[PDB]
Amino acid sequence: SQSNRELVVDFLSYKLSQKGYSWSQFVIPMAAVKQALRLAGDEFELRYRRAFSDLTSQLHITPGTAYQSFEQVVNELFRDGVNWGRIVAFFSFGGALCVESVDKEMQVLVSRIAAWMATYLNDHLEPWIQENGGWDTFVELYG
DSSP states (O other), X not given: XXXXXXXXXXXXXXXXXXXXXXXXXXXXXXXXXXXXXXXXXXXXXXXOOSTTHHHHHHHOOOTTOOHHHHHHHHGGGGTTOOOHHHHHHHHHHHHHXXXXXXXXXXXXXXXXXXXXXXXXXXXXXXXXHHHTTXXXXXXXXXX
């Protein structure tokens, strides 16, 4: 919850920096988890460059968008359940949403998206993560 919050912020900050944007609107194995996640995300966006076009448009985020709408859209990535690659897609998707928000002069949504991701991670993804090795297995797999 606290760790996950930090993890989400780091990945989103990484993505924004990398793409020329500001991250101002915002390490035990943690440092290792963070780096593994940064690498996983880059590899992902490398193979898939569509940038979640339909998912973001299906969501069309504005300052009035509620978590439930975010949650419903994100659920689409997990229609067949959770797996590591889908978790990576989840982070990449949040990253795309932040970029889009900045491109629309709605930089105020980045901290909100981060909060939503942490909530979604703790609620829907940690159960599977903890059952399949925890973030140690993730590092072991993408580190």
